[PDB]
Amino acid sequence: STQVSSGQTYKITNVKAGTVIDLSGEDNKSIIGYPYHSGKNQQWTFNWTGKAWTLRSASSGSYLGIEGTPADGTRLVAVNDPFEWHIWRDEANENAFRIFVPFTNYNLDLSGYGDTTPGTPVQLWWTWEGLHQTWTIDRP
Ligand SMILES: OC[C@H]1O[C@@H](O)[C@H](O)[C@@H](O)[C@H]1O
Known part of the structure; x- marks a missing residue:
């Protein structure tokens, strides 16, 4: 593991x-699903803040975040300030994770x-059983 x-x-x-999870090379802002090709924009440096994880783009130094209120369909974007996430192991595949906005569903x-x-x-989306809400966190 x-x-x-x-x-x-x-x-x-x-x-x-x-x-x-890929920081788009089209705009250096939008977060998209893209096939892995060892891009630095496809690599995320994790820091534990004492209470949560922040995920920093290896290419741009921006953080993985959102703008405005969590809701179904809220887009992930690059943000300047560290944005805190919580990770929980998944039930269907316990080597994988769900990544949550703290204190939300x-x-x-x-x-x-x-x-x-x-x-x-x-x-973002309300949590449910679909496997497209589950993620492995792998060596680059
Ligand atoms: O169109 C989006 C794509 O842009 C490319 O420049 C980049 O290498 C990919 O990783 C992806 O972000």
Whole structure:
């Protein structure tokens, strides 16, 4: 297994689609599912703040975050300030994780029920059993 460790850098792979969380090279802002090609924009440095994880783009130094109120369909975006996440192991595949906005029922969701199309947005969605809401955190 791969330990998630503060100060280490990982790729984050959708269990259903097999694409990774990718900071779009089109705008350096939008967070999308894209096939892994060892891009620095596909690599995220994890830091434990004492209470939560922050995920920093290896390419841009922006953090993985959101803007405005968590809801179904809230887009993930690059943000300037560290944004705190909580991770919980999944029930269907216990080597995988669900990644939540703290104190909410909203977790990362690869949109369109895990569409494999490159560029598919990564968003928040209310937690439910679909495997497109589950992610492995892997060595780059
Ligand atoms: O169109 C989006 C794509 O842009 C490319 O430049 C980048 O290498 C990919 O990882 C992906 O972000």
